[PDB]
Design a protein around this ligand. Structure first.
Ligand SMILES: CNCCc1ccc(OC)c(Cc2cc(CCNC)cc(Cc3cc(CCNC)ccc3OC)c2OC)c1
Ligand SMILES: CC(C)CCC[C@@H](C)[C@H]1CC[C@H]2[C@@H]3CC=C4C[C@@H](O)CC[C@]4(C)[C@H]3CC[C@]12C
Lengths: 230, 55, 339, 267, 218
């Protein structure tokens, strides 16, 4: 499983650029794709979403009209055509696979991201920095502006970890379920509009920024970013 | 030739004979006691209301 | 002759077994459960209809979460359905179309199906590549599979038309135990709730209680005069029910080692394709091939209800672990989920 | 229908009886195929035919009820002039579905391996909406040029395209008779496994239903009122008996084309 | 209502429905032939003539038509338990060796098999294509050995044609409903390219009858 993106670089503002992402080693036509970007010293901001089989395409309200997301399944490739670029589009762009069925784990694999340089429901992670000692337990909470509990019982809150110098990585999907490759020392809990991620017996390579995301309705919104330090 | 198969069948019936059988009154009593002890936990005996019914 | 006196010793053992088991027959289950109030009319309406198969369904199986169910039909498809939202979670194409059994792993990570290809194929549902692929094919079992049933993610017991059952190790792929002793084709299999023993019902009109550990027949049960197509344990793990082509179901108890009750009716002359109990075991749901299902009161042998929503032979049915639903697949390509 | 009144009355009771039992049949067939049963590609043709007979028979209830209000209760209900236009659209699309069903059975017997394998799946939908579009177009342009659509129209184009619509019905009649003819020649020359008596009776039954029930109201609505040049002495006799015949066709179409085709499993 | 994930679940289920209808209309436009007959009766000769461990499937194409032959006789069990799986085949290709009459009552065993298959409740209207095999062997064997030891009531010339027509007449007369299904008797040589043509011509009648059933005309 590998998403590797290309097509970044320097764009003079007003110009245009196509970003491309090649997939390798997973059934690419069965997966919905997201583009989630990240500004140079800010958090993750979701940009665009194309479904499996291109049947449903959504965008963020700040990019709607100027950006176009388009997949091509025989080449196993994803494109984002970006027209009339402004200076707030300077970011690092991440391709995300996500598959949706009963019991699935969406947003589970993220790409490595490309650097663009241009020359609803809100999430409030109230703590921006936590002083951490290894071996201890750390609880990280975030606030929603709406009850994320749906009528079917799922509370669509997603906990991601971005280790420094890397791409973010799914820890918990739907407030309580551990992702594959995630140890049992991570746990999540909460009620509607109030959630926490607990890390019992914290070791190293848990240092990074923790983002909480909603999947109740589009646009998908992340937290500002709770950062751990050792 | 066939007597090895016949001796296998005689040993099967020979372990089959020596077994502790309880009487069928006790057996029917345990079946009836299981069905009474779990009758409130059966959502097809008793009609479930539509609140906790997921259908 | 030595073979003739050996057959004489065999029939003497059979006569001693029949006399020793009628010596423990003092009172029928009808005579004990005649003061019990009946369950009344069981009215179950069709709550879901699952419509994606394009051929005759021979097997379904429920998940342990009582929401996912796998379904096998002759178009080379097994579909994993979300039973609540009527959605299709997975559509898994089969390498052989002729599929007469399917099972769903109790962890939920695997399905396994088999048929006339003589192979229980095992499919890993939960892959990082996102699709379903074949994990193992359990070859070498020299007859069509009638029923394969999981114990763990690593053990599975198959039954077949080479008169044998088997216990397999999935990861090595080689069968570890062979259960021999039926003389007809083994048509159905049911594991106990503790999974340390199981029953197999076959075409010699006899059901045998096996033992998964040491690998040999503990008890043998007769009483049907025709070939047994369906088998199911009671939820206690002590009784089981058989269904066959002489239009009767029968209840056997393992400790009493004999017949207790015959679920028969003179209106019914057709065969039985599937049985299951409810969660308390008061209802025995037999699927027939006069196109419907009957719900028998399993303690009094009344016929409490009729599930009559199919336009062909009811071929498979299954009750959830919750007891909240009964699904009934059939030969007219429709699952109906009843409640 | 108020031109003679007294001479048409027991035909009007046969209109209401036959159109009610045909409305029950067409609505039950439409609910069965469109919603309940699984549709094969012939069921698109049975579906559009049942919809055309549904519209035709319900508009004959409306034109029956105007006469029933005028003769008995004496309320002049003025149901408007474009009801006749969509009634004729229902009539021409019903006859075009009859001819298209006959052509499809001929194509399934004459080229059976094309019909099994190389046949496009949505060809029934394309043919149904194209002949419904041509039926609707001819009916509204006939209503536009004869005064049934917003009270304008010249007679010299009205008889000219009434003749074109009647030429369309005799073209549909020769397509139905030629397709049933080629179908019966290819079967009775070279069949092996088919029940030929039930097939013979069904094919000649559909041809005699199209001849003696459907086509008379069309040839008396599009030819006879321009050629025979009589408006009072014969119209009161031949108009309601023609509506009796085509209401009988539109009532007996689902019991031939669906109920014999599906519910022999009952008895 | 539906959340943002349940809508994508329903969209996934709809796309699975489109793949299921594509595969079902792909398999519905195909001829399924059940190959039957006793052992050592030239079914291997038949499956090398159409094309060139339980059930053997063979796929071949002839005159824009895709055929799947199922040789199910490799696996031995009680046939009544799995014979309902082939209800709905287009035709049953039965194979009978003509030169297997003097060996051991094998022709009486294949008549027993033909009586079981032809009068079955699942193939009550399925057409049968009957291939009488090894006819050159039957020609060279009928001169030295008579047909009396297979059929004792047979009175006729011990040439190829009258006794072969007698074996046809016996095999045609095993059915109880002559009006319901068709039996297409053919004779295979050692090597000839016309057996798949005979299968195609017998299948065309079943395709015509199924097309007429499809159009309500039966
Ligand atoms: C005695 N006059 C009393 C009025 C009266 C009589 C009989 C009658 O039913 C026949 C009708 C109804 C009626 C019926 C049709 C149906 C055939 N075409 C679709 C057409 C028209 C229009 C029409 C017809 C003609 C020549 C017809 N020759 C018989 C000339 C001009 C004209 O409108 C410009 C009709 O009139 C509105 C009305
Ligand atoms: C283009 C315009 C004229 C069409 C509108 C006509 C109206 C009255 C309706 C009545 C019944 C309808 C049909 C009902 C059934 C189907 C089957 C579907 O698979 C294709 C569309 C089709 C064939 C519909 C086409 C439109 C239709 C014929």
């Amino acid at each position: 499983v590998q998403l590797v993106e290309s097509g970044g670089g320097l764009v003079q503002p007003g110009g245009s650029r196509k970003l491309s992402c090649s997939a390798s080693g997973f059934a690419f036509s069965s997966f919905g794709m997201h583009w989630v970007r990240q500004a140079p010293e800010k958090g993750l901001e979701w940009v665009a979403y194309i479904s499996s089989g291109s049947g449903t395409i959504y965008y963020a309200d700040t990019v709607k009209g100027r950006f176009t997301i388009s997949r091509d399944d025989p080449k196993n490739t994803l494109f984002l055509q970006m027209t009339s670029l402004r200076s707030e589009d300077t970011a690092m762009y991440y391709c995300v696979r996500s598959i949706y069925y009963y019991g699935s784990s969406p947003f589970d694999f993220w790409g490595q991201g490309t650097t663009l340089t241009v020359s609803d429901i809100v999430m409030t992670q109230a703590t921006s920095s936590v002083p951490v000692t290894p071996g201890e337990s750390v609880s990280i909470s975030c606030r929603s502006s709406k009850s994320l509990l749906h009528s079917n019982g799922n509370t669509y809150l997603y906990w991601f970890l971005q280790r420094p110098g890397q791409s973010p990585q799914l820890l918990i999907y739907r407030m309580s379920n551990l992702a594959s490759g995630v140890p049992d020392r991570f746990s999540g809990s909460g009620s509607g509009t109030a959630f926490t991620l607990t890390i019992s017996r914290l070791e190293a390579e848990d240092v990074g920024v923790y983002y909480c995301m909603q999947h109740l309705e589009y646009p998908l919104t992340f937290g500002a970013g709770t950062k751990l330090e050792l | 030739a066939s007597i090895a198969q016949a001796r296998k069948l005689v040993e099967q019936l020979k372990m089959e004979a020596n077994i502790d059988r309880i009487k069928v009154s006790k057996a029917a009593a345990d079946l009836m006691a299981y069905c009474e002890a779990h009758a409130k936990e059966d959502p097809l005996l008793t009609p479930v209301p539509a609140s906790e019914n997921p259908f | 002759s030595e073979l003739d006196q050996l057959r004489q010793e065999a029939e003497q053992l059979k006569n001693q077994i029949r006399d020793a088991r009628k010596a423990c027959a003092d009172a029928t289950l009808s005579q004990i459960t005649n003061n019990i109030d009946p369950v009344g009319r069981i009215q179950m309406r069709t709550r879901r209809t699952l419509r994606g198969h394009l051929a005759k369904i021979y097997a379904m199986h429920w998940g342990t979460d009582s929401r996912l169910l796998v379904s096998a039909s002759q178009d080379g498809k097994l579909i994993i359905w979300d039973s609540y939202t009527t959605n299709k979670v997975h559509a898994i194409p089969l390498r052989s179309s002729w599929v007469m059994t399917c099972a769903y792993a109790p962890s939920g990570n695997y399905v396994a199906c088999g048929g006339l290809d003589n192979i229980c194929s095992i499919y890993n549902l939960k892959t990082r590549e996102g699709n379903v692929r074949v994990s193992r094919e359990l070859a070498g079992h020299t007859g069509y599979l009638s029923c394969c049933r999981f114990l763990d993610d690593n053990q599975i017991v198959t039954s077949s038309g080479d008169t044998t059952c088997a216990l397999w190790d999935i990861e090595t792929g080689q069968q570890t135990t062979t259960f021999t002793g039926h003389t007809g084709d083994v048509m159905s299999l049911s594991l106990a709730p503790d999974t340390r023993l199981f029953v197999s019902g076959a075409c010699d009109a006899s059901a045998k209680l096996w033992d998964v550990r040491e690998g040999m027949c503990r008890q043998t049960f007769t009483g049907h005069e025709s070939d047994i197509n369906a088998i199911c344990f009671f939820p206690n793990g002590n009784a089981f029910a058989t269904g066959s082509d002489d239009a009767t179901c029968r209840l056997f108890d393992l400790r009493a080692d004999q017949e207790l009750m015959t679920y028969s009716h003179d209106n019914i002359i057709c065969g039985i394709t599937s049985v299951s109990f409810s969660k308390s075991g008061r209802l025995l749901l037999a699927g027939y091939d006069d196109f419907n299902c009957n719900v028998w009161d399993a303690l009094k042998a009344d016929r409490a209800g009729v599930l009559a929503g199919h336009d062909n032979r009811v071929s498979c049915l299954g009750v959830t672990d919750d007891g909240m639903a009964v699904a009934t697949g059939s030969w007219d390509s429709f699952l109906k989920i009843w409640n | 229908l108020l031109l003679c009144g007294k001479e048409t009355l027991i035909p009007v009771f046969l209109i209401l009886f036959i159109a009610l039992v045909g409305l029950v049949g067409n609505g039950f067939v439409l609910w069965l195929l469109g919603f309940r049963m699984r549709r094969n590609a012939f069921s698109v043709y049975v579906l559009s035919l049942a919809g055309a007979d549904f519209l035709f028979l319900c508009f004959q209830i409306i034109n029956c009820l105007v006469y029933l209000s005028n003769f008995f209760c004496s309320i002049s209900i003025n149901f408007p002039s474009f009801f006749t236009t969509v009634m004729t659209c229902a009539y021409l699309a019903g006859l075009s579905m009859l001819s298209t069903v006959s052509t499809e059975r001929c194509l399934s017997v004459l080229w059976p391996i094309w019909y099994r394998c190389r046949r496009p799946r949505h060809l029934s939908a394309v043919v149904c909406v194209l002949l419904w579009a041509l039926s609707l177009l001819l009916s509204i342009l006939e209503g536009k040029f004869c005064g049934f659509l917003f009270s304008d129209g010249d007679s010299g184009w009205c008889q000219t395209f009434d003749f074109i619509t009647a030429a369309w019905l005799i073209f549909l009649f020769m397509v139905l008779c030629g397709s049933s003819l080629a179908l019966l020649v290819r079967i009775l020359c070279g069949s092996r496994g088919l029940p030929l008596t039930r097939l013979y009776l069904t094919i000649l039954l559909t041809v005699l239903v199209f001849l003696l029930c459907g086509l008379p109201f069309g040839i008396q609505w599009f030819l006879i009122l321009w050629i025979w040049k009589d408006s009072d002495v014969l119209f009161c006799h031949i108009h309601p008996v023609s509506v009796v015949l085509s209401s009988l066709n539109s009532s007996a179409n689902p019991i031939i084309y669906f109920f014999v085709g599906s519910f022999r499993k009952q008895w | 209502t539906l959340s943002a994930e349940d809508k994508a679940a329903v969209e996934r289920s709809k796309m699975i429905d489109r793949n299921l209808r594509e595969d079902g209309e792909k398999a519905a436009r195909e001829v399924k032939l059940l190959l039957l007959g006793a052992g050592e009766s030239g079914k291997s000769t038949i499956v090398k003539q159409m094309k060139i461990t339980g059930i053997v499937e063979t796929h071949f194409t002839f005159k824009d038509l895709h055929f799947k032959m199922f040789d199910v006789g490799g696996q031995r069990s009680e046939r009544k338990k799995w014979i309902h799986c082939f209800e709905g085949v287009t035709a049953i290709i039965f194979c009978v060796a003509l030169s297997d009459y003097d060996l051991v009552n094998r022709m009486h065993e294949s008549m027993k098999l033909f009586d079981s298959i032809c009068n079955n409740k699942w193939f009550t209207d399925t057409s049968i294509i009957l291939f009488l095999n090894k006819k050159d062997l039957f020609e060279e064997k009928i001169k030295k050995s008579p047909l009396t030891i297979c059929y004792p009531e047979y009175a006729g010339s011990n040439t190829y044609e009258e006794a072969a027509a007698y074996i046809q007449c016996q095999f045609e007369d095993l059915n109880k409903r002559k009006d319901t299904k068709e039996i297409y008797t053919h004779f295979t040589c050692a090597t000839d390219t016309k057996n798949v043509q005979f299968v195609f011509d017998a299948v065309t009648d079943v395709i015509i009858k199924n097309n007429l059933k499809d159009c309500g005309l039966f």
